[PDB]
């Protein structure tokens, strides 16, 4: 099986390259603000008629203008939804929601996560929904690519104060970047069978005497930066498993697509900046190494499957529970790796009702950085986390101090780099810490065992590293789970942002050097086999004991 | 300060009042069935969507993937799953009984059962069962409406959209639009 | 949760707290 | 000076009287070593109150694991004091030099003053002061009066004597050597405390060593890992107490112990010392930890041609071609006029121009040597010992006095000038009479085997340049003879800092390297400032590093140990990092076998017990400090190579050293608990 296993993944970055390379340099364009061909002049209208100086600003005013975005951000959001009552286009009689279950979800859409612990259809209307959960959805992407420009503008400027402009950046990524690629995936969507209308909720008198009432309304506009910005919030409880949100084979691999479409073009726009494409390519060269060996032990933990299918008379040990069989087990395994590893979180197939030896690797792939071809915004920095800690432990066993790209690595950029990476480790082990001493956590299991710690552990692993993913057996709706969440994701997010910024601000007063004699080689298969080497033991030397009381008990009982 | 606020009240049209409406139109523009829901119709008369899937508990048609969502099976209030563990005992008391209720149920059938005729679904919503799981379970429908296999065989393989790529997803046998037009064969 | 489970806690987040302390300074 | 004694069993002993005294709360700066202090405290807290009264009673087990945990606090302090203790003997091997003198002063400035009887440490900057022959200098300064070779051994061990100069490039003298042949008069520049002795006293007798900003820099990863394995430990019991029954606190302290990176944090102090005494066992001082572990990453330096290429003497001498003088007649009253020429600088053709021939044929004073010192209406120094004439012709005084008797050369000597430009020296002319002798020059004597030490330096890829005040056609002949990169003459001390940035501007770091005055602005603004020993005492004060024996390619030893306080540093962090895979194969399927007894499938390397186990880590976790001693003190050994080609070796010794070794140490520990069969 798996000779149409590897074909897959083969297509899958086939495919992906090809579609990157000519949107790298799309975004290289807009990191050197180099206006894109065709918006210059209607950019001389949209910054001067809403105002917007163009002025250079340094770092500490850079970071309240996202997280200033980002404070409005949420209040519009907790506001839309506590009067969600007294509010247009619901065609059902939804009523205002507990501020619980607002504040879980007002966080949750602000901070590139997307957690749903509540069934989308019951919840919420369309003006909910469209004009409050998809302004978010653009303006979430938006805000960690606008971190990201000024962490590549801070590897190129020289001896400068000045990143760049937030609000110049921010007007370029939403209707440059996200509108018009997005409005591509949705009316693909339309067309394969995905949903998109303003109707009622259409009841339906079936073959049999049993009667259905079809949820209808704005999915596959909502459904296109689902994928696109690595956000995962599906309209209906299941984020990429109902029909309506992902109708055949094709659209799903047009999503696997859009998942992997902003973080993996952002780094061949990355290598353009610096002039040399290899220093970008072999970025690339340690995120996917790490990923083809994290879907083909997925893959063959699925294909291996539930063992007591066999005794119990079926055809095959396939683990086809909890899968759509619209999909495969091949596609519904990388999928629920794409998903995890890239902070997207849409559900295409329980994650519960894996096996716990391939259920391990979406809850590892979370719970190390979120950097393994990681989400819009989080999956460069969350990298360059561990690109500044490699080359640390690099440059100083030659017996030199640890430059990258010209700019040395001192002790200001190391005070930060620690508190940068030490915020999600924490919280995922607070966290689960918490929510296993108290009986609010306790009693929202679903499954028994080992797997119902793991639960626990699935939950707030995707919330520290914005993930959005679910086990989803989590009963989430108690008072406790969504605002224990609700400061484990506001944490997780912009208690990242803030010494990533302090990190790009100490990098763009310094000098970039030139290359030497003795100067490291960032490119090259020994690097990348260092800084693999690097991600994949801090990253598990940190949750192996995690991991041996949640799934691993779990796999070798 | 004040362009601040005067830059997200301008990412507040554009993005979600202009570009799902710009969605809106242009689906309906263009795509008028698949965007009211793919829904088939008899007359006034709605016989559900292409793509959701319905309750199957009569004899003559073809069963789906047991869906267990919150109240009824296949109920799209819910949309969920069952999100049962493999470590968990209760997945075997469903299981067992899935066959229980199966295997003598199709007693010309094979003493095996294909594995999405048994297992629960992801959405709850599964329309669609392979092809080989739709020829499984031939040899009961016929005889329970005096048909031969080899029209139902052809039957099936008329509802039987395969991927474009033969790994992009897997070979599906539509079950709506197939027991819809089970009875229209009847006639 | 005893009386030596919250004496625990706080030994944790003395330790905790003065790591993170050390690690702000050039000690 | 055997330069090198792990266990001198002296040393040891009056170090274990001292490790136990850096067991209490002043371990706090170190924060690494601080938690297993805290780890080896309440494991006794623990064991102290399951002997009378607990929840469990295995007090046999528990006291066992805090009977090592004190043991690697008690390893970890003693690497520290080691290299503390290695540096009192090795600055008491020169300390031992200087209170053992008191001085005697003239108070008249001439030679032959009256006397009195003064200790050595009443002087201060300004005193004349008389140091016959055979006594030891008693305090630094500069010479003056008088001229001899003076022998410095007791500072810096040397089989050979160093000879001196009055108010010429010997300036140097340091209180502690012993003199030999001749007096000198020598006046204090320092004063007690300002000592140059003092600079490594106060340094190394002392907790005063700052730290390094690497060594700053490694330790905030080195908290930053023991921050999560707080967390990922301290957090294990109520992961763990949920599903069945808990784990003791006695595990989660041994598992906290066993992934703190315990084998740094009890090294990082012992490299950061042993480090700068292995820079003062190879003859240099240094002022502070940053000139050493800047000096990793240098890529451009610079050198003076007075003193530092060659010995500073100014002096040569080659021959006399001249038509009519016989070879033989070289010696002949130019030997004389050489000792006419009072210069120590004429000294060297008494020397350098008989050793082919050797011609001893005269005495001093016999011939009416009329011994004519350096005039000034000639600026000159001749004898009238044959019956004609024998001045010293100057550069532009040929025709003003020696010539001005109408009797020239034949245009013979206009060539000289040329062949000086073929030789690119200081020259001296000589005539005498109508017998033109013509040129003996002075070029430059270029001291070591340097061919080969600035071969060693372009392997490590550093572009070497020499800088000098002097002129264009001298840098020629003694480029080719140095074998340098590149070359710059005609520099003032300020277009010396007009080098210096103009490499600091492009980012790189700079090593000027020299002796004099005109150094002195340089070395006070560049990265690594080497000064010579045989500089001015105004030089070396404002460098920032000192040789002990005037080797300019002693840089080369100094980024050999600028690299080894980085390359044991980066090392021990991927062993430590590296050992902690092994560490979990050895504690996880054995603290939760009473918990989840489905983990002991994960004991791969067949341990015994689920005590032992435990025990077996934590022994090994305290033998490794002590095994890797020798590895903090003798630094790391390298083939000079590139950048990607080391990083691949150093990788296979600790990258992947680190995780075989413990999948082996846990396994022979583990026997040998079970060969006794203790626990
Ligand atoms: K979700
Ligand atoms: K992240
Ligand atoms: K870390």
């Known amino acids: 099986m798996a000779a149409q296993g590897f074909l897959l993944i083969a297509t899958f970055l086939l495919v992906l390259m090809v579609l990157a390379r000519p949107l790298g340099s799309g975004l290289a364009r807009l990191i050197n603000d180099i206006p894109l061909p065709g918006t210059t002049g209607v950019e001389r209208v949209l910054f001067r008629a809403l105002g917007v100086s163009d002025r250079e600003m340094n770092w500490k005013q850079y970071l309240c203008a996202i997280l200033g975005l980002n404070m409005l951000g949420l209040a519009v959001l907790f506001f839309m939804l506590l009067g969600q009552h007294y509010l247009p286009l619901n065609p059902q009689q939804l009523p205002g929601l507990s501020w619980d279950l607002a504040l879980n979800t007002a966080v949750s859409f602000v901070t590139n996560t997307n957690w749903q612990s509540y069934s989308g259809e019951t919840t919420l209307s369309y003006f909910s929904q469209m004009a409050g959960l998809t302004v978010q959805n653009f303006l979430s992407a938006a805000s960690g690519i606008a971190v990201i420009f000024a962490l590549i503008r801070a590897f190129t400027r020289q001896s400068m104060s000045t990143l760049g402009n937030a609000w110049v950046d921010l007007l370029r990524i939403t209707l440059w970047v996200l509108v018009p690629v997005a409005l591509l995936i949705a009316l693909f969507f339309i067309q394969q069978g995905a949903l998109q209308n303003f109707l009622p909720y259409q009841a339906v008198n079936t073959v049999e005497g049993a009667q259905q009432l079809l949820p209808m309304g704005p999915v596959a506009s909502q459904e296109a930066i689902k994928m696109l910005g690595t956000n995962g919030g599906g309209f209906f409880n299941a984020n990429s498993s109902h029909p309506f949100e992902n109708p055949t084979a094709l659209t799903n691999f047009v999503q696997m697509l859009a998942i992997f479409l902003i973080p993996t073009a952002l780094c061949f726009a990355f290598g353009e900046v610096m002039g040399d494409r290899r220093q970008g390519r072999m970025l690339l060269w340690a995120m996917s190494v790490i990923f083809v060996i994290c879907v083909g032990v997925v893959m063959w933990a699925e294909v291996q499957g539930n063992p007591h299918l066999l005794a119990l008379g079926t055809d095959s040990s396939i683990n086809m529970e909890g899968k759509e069989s619209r999909f495969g087990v091949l596609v519904s395994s990388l999928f629920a790796v794409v998903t995890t590893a890239a902070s997207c979180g849409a559900v295409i197939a329980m994650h519960d009702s894996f096996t716990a030896l391939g259920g391990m690797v979406p809850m590892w792939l979370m719970q190390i950085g979120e950097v393994v071809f990681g989400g819009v915004g989080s999956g460069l920095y969350g990298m360059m986390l561990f690109v500044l800690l490699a080359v640390f432990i690099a440059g100083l066993m030659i017996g030199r101090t640890p430059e990258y790209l010209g700019k040395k690595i001192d002790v200001r950029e190391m005070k930060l780099t620690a508190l940068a990476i030490l915020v999600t480790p924490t919280l995922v082990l607070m966290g689960a810490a918490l929510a296993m001493m108290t009986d609010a956590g306790r009693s929202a299991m679903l499954n028994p065992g080992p797997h119902g710690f793991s639960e626990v552990l699935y939950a707030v692993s995707s919330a520290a590293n914005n993930n959005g993913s679910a086990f989803a057996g989590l009963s989430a709706n108690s008072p406790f789970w969504n605002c224990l969440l609700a400061f484990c994701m506001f944490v997780g997010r912009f208690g990242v942002i803030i010494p990533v910024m302090a990190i790009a601000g100490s990098l763009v007063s310094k000098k970039s050097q030139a290359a030497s004699s003795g100067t490291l080689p960032t490119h090259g298969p020994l690097f990348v086999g260092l800084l693999i080497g690097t991600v994949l033991l801090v990253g598990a030397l940190t949750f192996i004991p995690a991991l041996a009381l949640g799934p691993v008990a779990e796999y070798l009982s | 300060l004040r362009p601040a606020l005067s830059t997200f009240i301008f990412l507040l049209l554009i993005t979600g009042g202009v570009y799902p409406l710009l969605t809106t139109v242009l689906g309906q523009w263009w795509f008028p069935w698949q965007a009211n829901g793919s829904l088939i119709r008899e007359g006034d008369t709605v016989r559900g969507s292409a793509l959701i899937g319905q309750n199957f508990t009569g004899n003559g048609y073809f069963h789906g993937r047991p869906s267990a969502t919150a109240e009824m099976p296949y109920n799209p209030q819910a949309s969920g799953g069952s999100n049962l563990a493999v470590s968990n005992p209760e997945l075997d008391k469903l299981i067992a009984a899935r066959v229980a209720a199966l295997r003598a149920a199709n007693p010309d059938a094979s003493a095996s059962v294909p594995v999405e005729l048994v297992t629960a679904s992801a959405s709850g919503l599964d329309n669609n069962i392979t092809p080989q799981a739709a020829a499984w379970q031939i040899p009961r429908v016929a005889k329970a409406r005096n048909l031969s296999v080899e029209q139902l065989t052809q039957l099936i393989a008329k509802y039987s959209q395969q991927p474009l790529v033969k790994y992009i997803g897997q070979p599906v046998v539509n079950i709506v639009e197939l027991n819809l037009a089970l009875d229209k064969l009847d006639e | ?27 | 000076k055997q330069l090198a004694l792990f266990e001198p069993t002296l040393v040891v002993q009056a170090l274990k009287e001292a490790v136990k005294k850096l067991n209490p709360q002043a371990q706090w700066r170190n924060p690494v070593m601080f938690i297993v202090w805290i780890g080896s405290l309440l494991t006794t807290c623990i064991s102290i109150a399951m002997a009378s009264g607990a929840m469990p009673g295995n007090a046999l087990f528990s006291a066992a694991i805090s009977g090592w945990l004190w043991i690697t606090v008690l390893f970890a302090n003693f690497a520290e004091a080691l290299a503390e203790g290695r540096s009192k003997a090795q600055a008491n091997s020169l300390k031992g030099v200087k209170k053992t003198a008191f001085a005697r002063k003239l108070r008249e400035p001439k030679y032959g003053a009256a006397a009195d009887k003064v200790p050595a440490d009443q002087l201060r900057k300004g005193d004349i002061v008389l140091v016959e022959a055979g006594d030891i200098i008693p305090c630094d300064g500069e010479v003056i009066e008088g001229g001899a070779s003076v022998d410095e051994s007791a500072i810096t061990g040397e089989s050979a004597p160093v000879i001196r100069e009055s108010g010429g490039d010997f300036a140097s003298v340091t209180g502690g050597t012993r003199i030999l042949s001749d007096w000198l008069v020598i006046e204090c520049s320092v004063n007690p405390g300002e000592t140059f002795l003092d600079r490594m006293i106060a340094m190394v007798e002392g907790a005063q060593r700052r730290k390094t900003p690497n060594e700053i820099a490694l330790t905030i990863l080195l908290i930053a890992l023991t921050i999560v394995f707080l967390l990922a430990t301290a957090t294990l019991w109520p992961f763990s107490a949920w599903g069945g029954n808990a784990v003791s606190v006695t595990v989660l302290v041994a598992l906290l112990v066993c992934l703190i990176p315990t084998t740094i944090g009890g090294l990082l102090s012992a490299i950061g010392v042993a480090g700068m005494s292995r820079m003062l066992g190879a003859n240099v001082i240094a002022t502070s930890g940053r000139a050493v572990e800047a000096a990793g990453d240098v890529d451009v330096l610079l050198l003076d041609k007075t003193g530092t290429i060659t010995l500073g003497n100014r002096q040569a001498s080659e021959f006399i071609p001249a038509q009519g003088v016989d070879e033989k007649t070289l010696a002949d009253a130019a030997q004389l006029a050489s000792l006419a020429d009072e210069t120590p600088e004429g000294r060297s053709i008494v020397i350098l121009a008989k050793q082919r021939f050797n011609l001893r044929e005269r005495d001093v004073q016999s011939l009416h040597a009329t011994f004519v010192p350096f005039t000034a209406q000639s600026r000159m120094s001749g004898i009238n010992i044959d019956n004609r004439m024998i001045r010293k012709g100057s550069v532009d005084a040929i025709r003003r006095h020696v010539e001005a008797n109408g009797g020239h050369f034949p245009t013979d000597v206009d060539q000289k000038v040329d062949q000086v430009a073929r030789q690119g020296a200081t020259p001296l002319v000589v005539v005498e009479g109508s017998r033109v002798l013509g040129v003996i020059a002075l070029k430059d004597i270029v001291k070591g085997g340097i061919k080969e030490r600035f071969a060693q330096l372009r392997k490590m890829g550093i572009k070497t340049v020499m800088i000098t005040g002097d002129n264009r056609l001298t840098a020629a002949a003694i480029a080719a003879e140095a074998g340098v990169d590149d070359f710059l003459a005609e520099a003032t001390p300020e277009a010396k800092l007009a080098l210096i940035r103009q490499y600091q501007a492009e980012g790189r770091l700079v090593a000027m390297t020299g002796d004099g005055t005109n150094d002195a602005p340089a070395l006070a603004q560049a990265d690594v400032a080497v000064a010579m020993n045989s500089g001015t005492q105004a030089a070396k004060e404002a460098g920032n590093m000192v040789d002990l024996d005037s080797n300019p390619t002693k840089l080369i030893e100094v980024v050999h140990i600028g690299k080894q306080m980085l390359m044991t540093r980066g090392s021990l962090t991927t062993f430590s990092i590296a050992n902690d895979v092994a560490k979990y194969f050895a504690i996880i399927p054995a603290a939760f076998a009473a918990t989840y007894p489905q983990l002991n499938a994960l004991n791969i390397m067949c341990l015994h017990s689920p005590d032992s186990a435990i025990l077996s880590a934590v022994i090994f976790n305290a033998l490794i400090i002590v095994f890797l001693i020798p590895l903090a003190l003798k630094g790391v050994s390298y083939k000079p190579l590139t950048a990607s080609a080391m990083l691949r070796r150093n990788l296979w010794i600790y990258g992947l050293g680190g995780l075989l070794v413990p999948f082996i140490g846990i396994k022979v520990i583990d026997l040998l608990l079970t060969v006794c069969g203790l626990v």
């Open chain 3, 1 to 27: 949760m005893s009386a030596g489970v919250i004496t625990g806690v706080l030994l944790v987040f003395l330790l905790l707290g003065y790591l993170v302390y050390a690690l702000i300074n050039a000690e």
